[PDB]
Structure 1
Amino acid sequence: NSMKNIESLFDYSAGQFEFIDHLLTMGVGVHFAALIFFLVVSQFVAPKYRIATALSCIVMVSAGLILNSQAVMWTDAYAYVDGSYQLQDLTFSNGYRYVNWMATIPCLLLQLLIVLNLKGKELFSTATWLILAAWGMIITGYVGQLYEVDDIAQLMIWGAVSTAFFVVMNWIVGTKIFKNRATMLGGTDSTITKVFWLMMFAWTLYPIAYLVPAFMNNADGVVLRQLLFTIADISSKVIYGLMITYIAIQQSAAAGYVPAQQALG
Structure 2
Amino acid sequence: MPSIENFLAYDFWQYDVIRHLFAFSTAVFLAGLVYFAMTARTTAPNYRLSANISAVVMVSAALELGQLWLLWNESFQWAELQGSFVPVAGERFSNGYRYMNWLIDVPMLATQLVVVCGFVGTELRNRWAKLTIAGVLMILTGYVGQYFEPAVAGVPGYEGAEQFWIWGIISTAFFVWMLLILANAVRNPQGAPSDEVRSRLKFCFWFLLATWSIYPFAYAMPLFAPTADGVVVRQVIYTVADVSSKLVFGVILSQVALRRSAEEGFEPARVA
- TM superposition score normalised by structure 1: 0.95
CA offsets 1:136-192 (integer angstroms, 9 cap, x no match): 110110000111112332111110101001111101110111122783258311101
Q: How does 1:1-265 map to 2 (within 5 A)?
A: 3-81=1-79, 82=81, 83-88=83-88, 89-150=90-151, 151-180=160-189, 183-185=192-194, 187-263=196-272
1:180 is paired with a residue whose SS is coil
1:26 is paired with a residue whose SS is helix
- Using the aligned pairs only, state the percent identity: 38
**Structure 1 unaligned blocks of 5 or more:** none
1:146 is paired with a residue whose SS is helix
2:233 & 2:246 partners in 1: Cα distance? 20
1:153 & 1:74 partners in 2: Cα distance? 28
1:97 is paired with a residue whose SS is helix
How many residues were matched structurally?
261
2:195 & 2:43 partners in 1: Cα distance? 14
CA offsets 1:214-250 (integer angstroms, 9 cap, x no match): 1111111111111111111011101111111111111
1:179 is paired with a residue whose SS is coil
RMSD: 1.4
Q: Which amino acid aligns with 1:86?
A: V
2:77 is paired with a residue whose SS is strand
1:183 & 1:127 partners in 2: Cα distance? 21
What is the CA-CA distance between 1:125 and the residue it aligns to? 0.9
Q: Which moved more, 1:50-59 or 1:144-153?
A: 144-153
1:183 is paired with a residue whose SS is coil
Q: Which amino acid aligns with 1:114?
A: V
2:33 & 2:194 partners in 1: Cα distance? 26
Contact 2:2 2:92 in 1 (8 A): no
Q: Which amino acid aligns with 1:21?
A: R
Q: Which moved more, 1:20-29 or 1:149-158?
A: 149-158
Contact 2:218 2:237 in 1 (8 A): yes
Q: Which has the higher helix share?
A: 1
2:176 & 2:108 partners in 1: Cα distance? 19
Q: Which amino acid aligns with 1:250?
A: R
Contact 1:181 1:189 in 2 (8 A): no
Contact 1:133 1:169 in 2 (8 A): yes
What is the CA-CA distance between 1:211 and the residue it aligns to? 0.2
Q: Which moved more, 1:175-184 or 1:112-121?
A: 175-184
Q: Which amino acid aligns with 2:64?
A: I
1:166 is paired with a residue whose SS is helix
Contact 2:261 2:269 in 1 (8 A): yes
Report the equivalent of 2:156. none
